Design a protein around this ligand. Structure first.
Ligand code: HEM
Ligand SMILES: CC(C)(C(=O)c1cccnc1)c1cccnc1
Ligand code: NI
Ligand code: NI
Ligand code: NI
Ligand code: NI
Length: 460
């Protein structure tokens, strides 16, 4: 049964473009979904896409034989930063599967066990940072989470210490990255991108890329004059070869993956931890139930790998935070061939789809009407959830390669946070979600009273 697909207001030649003229476009989209329903057509000068919001339509979109990963307009712009790295490369593109084969061992199970000791190294620094604050001082939550997450991927991934906790301004890499990513997001609303009104923007962009590449230069150089070295993500990135082709990555594609993992390896994880701590202070009974598990499981000066894997309610807290606000709010898909979606919406070949993940996670036919409420108990049994109902990490072979990395780090750190501190909503923070292609609550500050529980010595 063919259906006519709804479409919001069109402003003439600009079509639906002026609707996304906001600091918060994803949220503007979610409200559009609330009016228009399962699916709606969205076009602008350039191309057309279709935003899905129901589990009914998305589980069909997640069929890898009917649909493949599409680079949305945003990704096509991010591609100017990350090139043909794992994130911004097409599925059937040369360097994707090549690097997918080379780098997947770096996120294997015994790769994770290797990262743990270093993950704790940074986690301790976060705790001690807070242990050493004065009585009056506030904790800027997303700022410090970014320090932790960036330093973790920098150390675990490349054996490079950003030393973010030795700076009270963000690292030069961060500032250039945020500007470059904000530019990619801002260029979407740009009528004539090559209008000289944005020469000013293109000049700052070339500079931010200079700064970011200057750091990749440091990482590769430090590895040169080393002799340990040894076996991390950069090691595979430099020496590994694709089994199917017997080829290593270019001198060029390597630089793209480093930039890819320096950005992707922290940008969304920082948001998750921030959203988790936000919901916890806004829901104190949840906070204490998780604080108990933290105190119960973590019985040593430093958490072990097994102990992190036993923080089950904490993991649920993280998953529920990812439900309400997936810090990677969307991914795109294209029809491999002609097909029908849900037996109602006929798609041509190459037609583009957008998975609106926060609205998917609010599907009342899956979760009930208490969708906006923060109950970690939804995930107390994983199998209870329909397939393709919970998609904070993408789908299929294009799903997040660092999903376990993020979740292990986030659980470990949140576990130590709850073992060592109580938390006060010092400002009664009104949630203000900042969008930079990713979701993150800005202006969020808390206060921590230490439980005076000692730490220990860092492993290896
Ligand atoms: C809460 C944390 C994270 C979230 C919510 C998240 C989300 C996602 C999503 C939605 C995708 C799909 C992209 C698409 O389909 O267009 C993805 C892919 C990817 N992510 Fe993550 N991610 C997280 C953490 C990480 C970490 C820690 C790393 C690296 C250490 C990472 C690196 C990547 C890479 C390289 C891809 C593309 C891989 C491929 O297509 O072969 N992400 N992620
Ligand atoms: C791919 C995705 C979703 C993303 O939107 C992205 C990628 C690079 C820079 N900024 C955002 C992402 C972001 C962070 C971690 N993994 C994936
Ligand atoms: Ni029918
Ligand atoms: Ni104060
Ligand atoms: Ni340079
Ligand atoms: Ni190896």
């Amino acid at each position: 049964t063919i259906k006519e697909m709804p479409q919001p207001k069109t402003f003439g030649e600009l079509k639906n473009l002026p609707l996304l003229n906001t600091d918060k476009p994803v949220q503007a989209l979610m409200k559009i979904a609330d009016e228009l329903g399962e699916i709606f057509k969205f076009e602008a000068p350039g191309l057309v896409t279709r935003y899905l919001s129901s589990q009914r339509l998305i589980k069909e979109a997640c069929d890898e034989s009917r649909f493949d990963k599409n680079l949305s307009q945003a990704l096509k712009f991010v591609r100017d930063i990350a090139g043909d790295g794992l994130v911004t490369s097409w599925t059937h593109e040369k360097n994707w599967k090549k690097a997918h084969n080379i780098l997947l061992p770096s996120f294997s199970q015994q790769a994770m066990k290797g990262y743990h000791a270093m993950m704790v190294d940074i986690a301790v620094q976060l705790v001690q940072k807070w242990e050493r604050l004065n009585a009056d001082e506030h904790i800027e939550v997303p700022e410090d989470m970014t320090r932790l997450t960036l330093d973790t991927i920098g150390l675990c991934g490349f054996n490079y210490r950003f030393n973010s906790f030795y700076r009270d301004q963000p690292h030069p890499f961060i500032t250039s990255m945020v500007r470059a990513l904000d530019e990619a997001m801002n260029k979407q609303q740009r009528a004539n991108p090559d209008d000289p009104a944005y020469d000013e923007n293109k000049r700052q962009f070339q500079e931010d890329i200079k700064v970011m590449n200057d750091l990749v230069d440091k990482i590769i150089a430090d590895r040169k004059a080393s002799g340990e070295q040894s076996d991390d993500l950069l090691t595979h990135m430099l020496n590994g070869k694709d089994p199917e082709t017997g080829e290593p990555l270019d001198d060029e594609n390597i630089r793209y993956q480093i930039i890819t993992f320096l950005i992707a390896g922290h940008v969304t994880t920082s948001g998750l931890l921030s959203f988790a701590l936000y919901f916890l202070v806004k829901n104190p009974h949840v906070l204490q139930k998780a604080a108990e598990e933290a105190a119960r499981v973590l019985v040593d000066p430093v958490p072990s790998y097994k102990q992190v894997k036993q923080l089950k309610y904490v993991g649920m807290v993280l998953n529920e935070a990812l439900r309400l606000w997936p810090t990677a709010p969307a991914f795109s898909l294209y029809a491999k061939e002609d097909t029908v979606l849900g037996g109602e919406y006929p798609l041509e070949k190459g037609d583009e789809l957008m998975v609106l993940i926060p609205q998917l996670h609010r599907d009342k036919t899956i979760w009930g009407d208490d969708v906006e409420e923060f109950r970690p108990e939804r995930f107390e049994n994983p199998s209870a959830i329909p397939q393709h109902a919970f998609k904070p990490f993408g789908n299929g072979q294009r799903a997040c390669i660092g999903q376990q990395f993020a979740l292990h780090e986030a659980t470990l750190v949140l576990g130590m946070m709850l073992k060592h501190f109580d938390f006060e909503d010092h400002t009664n923070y009104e949630l203000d979600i900042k969008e930079t292609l990713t979701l993150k609550p800005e202006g969020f500050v808390v206060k921590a009273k230490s439980k005076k529980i000692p730490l220990g010595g860092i492993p290896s």
